[PDB]
Design a protein around this nucleic acid. Structure first.
Ligand SMILES: [Cl-]
Ligand SMILES: [Cl-]
Ligand SMILES: [Cl-]
Ligand SMILES: [Cl-]
Ligand SMILES: [Cl-]
Ligand SMILES: [Mg+2]
Ligand SMILES: [Mg+2]
Ligand SMILES: [Mg+2]
Ligand SMILES: [Mg+2]
Ligand SMILES: [Mg+2]
Ligand SMILES: [Mg+2]
Ligand SMILES: [Mg+2]
Ligand SMILES: [Mg+2]
Ligand SMILES: [Mg+2]
Ligand SMILES: [Mg+2]
Ligand SMILES: [Mg+2]
Ligand SMILES: [Mg+2]
Ligand SMILES: [Mg+2]
Ligand SMILES: [Mg+2]
Ligand SMILES: [Mg+2]
Ligand SMILES: [Mg+2]
Ligand SMILES: [Mg+2]
Ligand SMILES: [Mg+2]
Ligand SMILES: [Mg+2]
Ligand SMILES: [Mg+2]
Ligand SMILES: [Mg+2]
Ligand SMILES: [Mg+2]
Ligand SMILES: [Mg+2]
Ligand SMILES: [Mg+2]
Ligand SMILES: [Mg+2]
Ligand SMILES: [Mg+2]
Ligand SMILES: [Mg+2]
Ligand SMILES: [Mg+2]
Ligand SMILES: [Mg+2]
Ligand SMILES: [Mg+2]
Ligand SMILES: [Mg+2]
Ligand SMILES: [Mg+2]
Ligand SMILES: [Mg+2]
Ligand SMILES: [Mg+2]
Ligand SMILES: [Zn+2]
Ligand SMILES: [Zn+2]
Lengths: 85, 91, 77, 100, 244
RNA sequence: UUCAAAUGAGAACUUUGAAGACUGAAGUGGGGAAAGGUUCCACGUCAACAGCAGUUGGACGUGGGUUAGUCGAUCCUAAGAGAUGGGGAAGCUCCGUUUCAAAGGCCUGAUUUUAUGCAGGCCACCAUCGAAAGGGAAUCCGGUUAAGAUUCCGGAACCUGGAUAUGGAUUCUUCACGGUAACGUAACUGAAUGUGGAGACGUCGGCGCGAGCCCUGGGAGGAGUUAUCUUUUCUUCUUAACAGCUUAUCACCCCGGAAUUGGUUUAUCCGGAGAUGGGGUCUUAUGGCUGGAAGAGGCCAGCACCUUUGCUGGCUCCGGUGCGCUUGUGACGGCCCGUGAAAAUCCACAGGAAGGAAUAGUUUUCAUGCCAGGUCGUACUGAUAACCGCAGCAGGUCUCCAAGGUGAACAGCCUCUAGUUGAUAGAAUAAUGUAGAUAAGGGAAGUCGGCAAAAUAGAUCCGUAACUUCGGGAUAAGGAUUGGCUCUAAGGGUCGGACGAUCAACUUAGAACUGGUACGGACAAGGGGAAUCUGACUGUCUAAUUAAAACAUAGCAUUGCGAUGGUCAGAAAGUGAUGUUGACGCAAU
RNA sequence: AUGGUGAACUAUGCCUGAAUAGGGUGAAGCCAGAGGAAACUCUGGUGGAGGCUCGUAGCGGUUCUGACGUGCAAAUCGAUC
């Protein structure tokens, strides 16, 4: 339990403590699935609330699939610029 | 982004079996995995099951065809020959 | 293995001619957010099934115990 | 960390020797042998699963009531509604064409 | 020496056909009154794969003329035949792909398949995928019909023999190389035990007439006469010529 | 391995206690299939056997022990085996399995002499054997013995076959009604015959969900540590078959009519053959609540006592989390010149032969009630001692369950549960060995030959040639970094409507500080480069001296054959293989 | 030479079952973006193919011509593979 608390603080995580590859420690596909589901969940939330229209929603849907936004707030900033013009 | 220059679907074979044999397989592999138009419903939903069997995803209809294509060149000629001879026995 | 929530059908079971034994079980359980109450269960042993009637009101429980047929073998606890 | 064993003489992992782990009122883990899952009856014409029909092993249908094994319509537990609709339309139109 | 490989196959112990997954023998209908005088209509139910056979098979259902039931027939599917299609078989059937007609009731140049050698044997010729028979003549006085076979031979057949209009489906199969030993293995896994093959010159003299020697060679002419006996017929039997 | 006690004539080896250790969940743990056959358990007991010993034992003597309508066998069919009818053969016998056969029996009508003669029709499928892992009607929990249990006891269920009554439903419109529909229900006539479904099915990949396990918070008990510290460390807090209600991705129905094309998966498919959207229907894998059921089981406290051994009390509660592990399952996707059993058996529908009501009948597919369920197997070992190898032999022998940490990990290493602590011992430390190791300077000078050994090794970043079938070569080659500690930055879910509040994951990157410059600190873990001969590759063989360049292989070419046939088998045959085959085929090189 | 017995080992076919951590490489298909008159050409993601590859269980048996060689064993033991 003491060792687990140190790791949650960021200890014992340097290059000398890693024996598997980055993919083995955390698959790239797992990372992609989590963020793409985040982006799609946000888009449906905005559309159902009336904050965005289906025409802009459809465009942003295929941009997120195309790796246009790196995280959630990058999509939000893009939407603000789109709605400010 | 283009991943291979010329091997295409035959990149699964690596460097084995010879370039000429891999080129021959490539031409036939694309045809048998291709999607074809259905003559019954007009949609692009016809794919191959076993060799010579072609089934449409919609309209649930199966047509007997070629080993790697829906219709062979030889079978197309036979249809024309039968049609020409059919009209000579009824008219 | 079967539960009944109607008193009228419970009394019909006690005179079904194939029922010979019954038992009364008293449970001391806590309600949602109040003082503990006594819960009683009436179990009738049929030929094929056991029928359990559960009532949480002690006032109505006393009447039902008295109204049981005098020719039925009733086991208390 | 309690480990379990088979409760029959068959020691192999076949389709008829599948088990599930459950906890008993005695507080210990014990294997539970489970029967193979049932398959829904299929339509005679199109092959799709029939709506409103119970899913059971073949011998179990003799124990359930008829209301669980049929639908209140022609070809109830044999053909689905859409296939029955096609049969009626085809029957009417073809017979009319025969007269003319 | 000992009994050679090709002699052992006749005993049929481990060299029998693997027929567990076969759909059934592919044959036409039995020649009956409706076939020889008129026509009978059948319905294609499904087109299915048959293990050990390149060409697909078609399941066609006919009605029994003499009692109330359905009869199931297994045909070799021609190109263009589809599920739900009506099939007409008989003397008065139309000239359409999939129909079964006598060879004497079709015009010159007709393409047919699953042709009967004799009336009623239910199909003997042109059964493999992509093969067909060309009708090239009629002899009405002698009730004979001249046809061309896939091998190129010319044969004279009775005009009452039946055939199916069209070409056997699945053509072009042999144009794709197997490309590895594994696919050859699975091909013959569902046919018979004839693969892989060991060369005779790699064996010992007790095993094969080509066996032995301090070099791997045949040592005598590989052209063997027709009159040779079992144990001798290894190589090119009764060859008229050799070479490219 | 060690100390002590007990037992005994006798104890390094038996028993008990204490200590030190190991197997470390792909076990030295807990069950089985074959095979063995009483080795199982108790009492007595040591001549022989346990390559020392023996008070001990799988030894010796005497007895005890295996309980089933629900677990298997029995039934079904698989490859295949094999009677009959017939044909061969001097003959023992051979062929063949629906075959040149007059091949057999269940619904009832007709009779009230007695039991089945006689009248239409139905069906022609024509032995039998073949699976303790395939198919398959039906059971669970608690307790109980020296040794038995899903088999005994208590309680609670279920199936099949057979008897029958009541209630309910239905009928004077004779064989039920509701919903536009998908369809719903406590029921709700259906012979011959026909049709369909279930039985019934490959493999791999990621994703969704469930169960058990793992991790963790609060609380109610017990135990351990307490010089000092630790609201601390360990442990108990469980819920079966079955039953009622309810619960779902998919699919489907009604309304509606879409380009400014929309919807939508991690993975691009779907829509005028009707999308999105709104409202409904259904399968019950699965989950929830209740009954079963706290009366059980578990954890504690206060009291009696040689005793047949007990009594009275309480508590047994409420949460969180996930690229976790194992396993089940759903919707999908990839692959084939490979498309991945059969039968018994059960159900539905089509059909409409008969049977049926008014002072009366029918449904045992609705509920309840009654009776019966035979035969054989069942102990134990399952292996460094119960099987086979001449044996208590370091060999061989099919399979299920699988905790914590480190780490990519079912690797190695340490630990918990459980199980062992067995293999003749004591003393000494010569040579030579077997096994494990280290070396100044030189670095293959050794040797047939770098044989053996050493060096390299994880991860992150940088960098990577000739040649090439363009796929590779490639971890080419060649460099740098890696601990600890204190911080910083980025990456999410949900909730009332423009922003806040609140909750919970290890992932990556960076910066200070610190040390005998150490840090994949044990464990784990590639040497590389320039060329020649040869086989293309993966694959295969001389069990017990040869693994290769030998065989095979894809590719290429030649040869025979259209069935009254080619190749091959048989003593013969009314006999066979290819052949459930037909030249894009079979056969022979 | 005559008449018999064996596929419990092993060789090959067939029928019915079962078993096989964790990594590296990144083929088709698909999405977005950039260059270009056009044909088209490039970049970043997604996806997870192969008688591919590192390496456990498993199967096999290269070398030390190691141990043993009246052996534990009429073929075994250890390391390496
Ligand atoms: Cl041979
Ligand atoms: Cl020495
Ligand atoms: Cl070469
Ligand atoms: Cl198998
Ligand atoms: Cl070895
Ligand atoms: Mg990827
Ligand atoms: Mg079984
Ligand atoms: Mg040789
Ligand atoms: Mg010879
Ligand atoms: Mg010769
Ligand atoms: Mg160890
Ligand atoms: Mg240990
Ligand atoms: Mg004993
Ligand atoms: Mg001794
Ligand atoms: Mg002695
Ligand atoms: Mg004895
Ligand atoms: Mg016989
Ligand atoms: Mg049998
Ligand atoms: Mg026992
Ligand atoms: Mg037992
Ligand atoms: Mg023996
Ligand atoms: Mg022996
Ligand atoms: Mg780790
Ligand atoms: Mg030195
Ligand atoms: Mg030195
Ligand atoms: Mg030298
Ligand atoms: Mg020298
Ligand atoms: Mg070496
Ligand atoms: Mg080689
Ligand atoms: Mg490989
Ligand atoms: Mg050898
Ligand atoms: Mg060797
Ligand atoms: Mg060779
Ligand atoms: Mg045969
Ligand atoms: Mg054998
Ligand atoms: Mg062979
Ligand atoms: Mg490898
Ligand atoms: Mg040696
Ligand atoms: Mg020696
Ligand atoms: Zn279509
Ligand atoms: Zn249908």
């Amino acid at each position: 339990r003491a060792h687990a608390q140190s790791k949650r603080e960021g200890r014992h995580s340097g290059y000398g403590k890693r024996k598997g590859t980055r993919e083995a420690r955390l698959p790239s596909q797992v990372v992609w699935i989590r963020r793409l589901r985040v982006l799609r969940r946000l888009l449906a939330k905005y559309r159902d609330a009336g904050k965005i229209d289906k025409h802009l929603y459809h465009v942003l849907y295929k941009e997120s699939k195309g790796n246009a936004f790196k995280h959630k707030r990058a999509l939000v900033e893009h939407i603000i610029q789109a709605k400010a013009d | 982004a283009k991943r291979t220059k010329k091997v295409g679907i035959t990149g699964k074979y690596g460097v084995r079996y010879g370039s000429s044999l891999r080129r021959q397989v490539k031409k036939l592999e694309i045809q048998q995995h291709a999607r074809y138009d259905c003559s019954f419903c007009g949609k692009k939903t016809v794919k191959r099951g076993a060799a010579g069997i072609w089934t449409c995803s919609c309209c649930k209809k199966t047509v007997a065809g070629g080993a790697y294509t829906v219709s062979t060149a030889a079978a197309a000629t036979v249809r024309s020959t039968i049609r020409r001879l059919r009209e000579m026995v009824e008219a | 293995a079967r539960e009944i929530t109607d008193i009228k059908q419970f009394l019909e079971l006690t005179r079904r001619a194939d029922v010979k034994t019954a038992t009364v079980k008293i449970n001391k359980k806590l309600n949602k957010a109040g003082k503990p109450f006594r819960q009683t269960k009436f179990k009738v042993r049929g030929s094929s099934s056991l029928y359990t009637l559960v009532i949480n009101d002690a006032g109505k429980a006393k009447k039902l115990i008295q109204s049981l047929p005098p020719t039925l073998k009733v086991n208390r606890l | 960390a309690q480990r379990v064993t088979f409760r029959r003489r068959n020691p192999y992992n076949t389709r008829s020797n599948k088990i599930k782990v459950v906890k008993t009122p005695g507080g210990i883990l014990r294997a539970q042998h489970v029967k193979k899952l049932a398959t829904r009856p299929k339509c005679g014409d199109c092959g799709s699963a029939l709506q409103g029909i119970s899913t059971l092993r073949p011998r179990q249908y003799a124990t359930v009531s008829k209301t669980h094994k049929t639908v209140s319509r022609a070809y109830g537990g044999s053909r689905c509604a859409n296939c029955v609709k096609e049969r009626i339309i085809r029957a009417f139109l073809i017979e009319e064409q025969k007269i003319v | 020496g000992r009994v050679i490989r090709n002699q052992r196959k006749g005993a049929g112990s481990i060299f029998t056909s693997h027929t567990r997954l076969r759909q059934g023998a592919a044959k036409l209908r039995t020649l009956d009154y409706a076939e020889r005088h008129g026509y009978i209509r059948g319905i294609v139910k499904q087109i299915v794969h048959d293990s050990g056979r390149g060409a697909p098979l078609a399941k066609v259902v006919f009605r029994d003329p003499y009692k109330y039931r359905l009869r199931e027939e297994i045909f070799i599917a021609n190109e263009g035949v589809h599920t739900g299609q009506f099939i007409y078989a008989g003397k008065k059937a139309s000239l359409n792909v999939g129909n079964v007609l006598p060879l004497g009731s079709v015009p010159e140049g007709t393409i047919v398949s699953n042709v009967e050698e004799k009336p009623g044997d239910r199909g003997a010729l042109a059964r493999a995928s992509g093969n067909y028979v060309i009708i090239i003549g009629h002899n009405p006085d002698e009730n004979k019909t001249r046809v061309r076979l896939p091998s190129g031979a010319k044969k004279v057949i009775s005009s009452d023999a039946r055939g199916v209009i069209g070409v056997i489906a699945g053509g072009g199969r042999v144009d794709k190389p197997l490309l590895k030993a594994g696919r050859a293995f699975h091909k013959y896994r569902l046919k018979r035990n004839s693969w892989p093959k060991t060369r005779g010159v790699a064996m010992n003299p007790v095993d094969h007439p080509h066996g032995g020697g301090n070099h791997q060679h045949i040592g005598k002419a590989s052209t063997i006469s027709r009159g040779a006996v079992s144990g001798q017929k290894a190589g090119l039997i009764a060859a008229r010529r050799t070479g490219l």
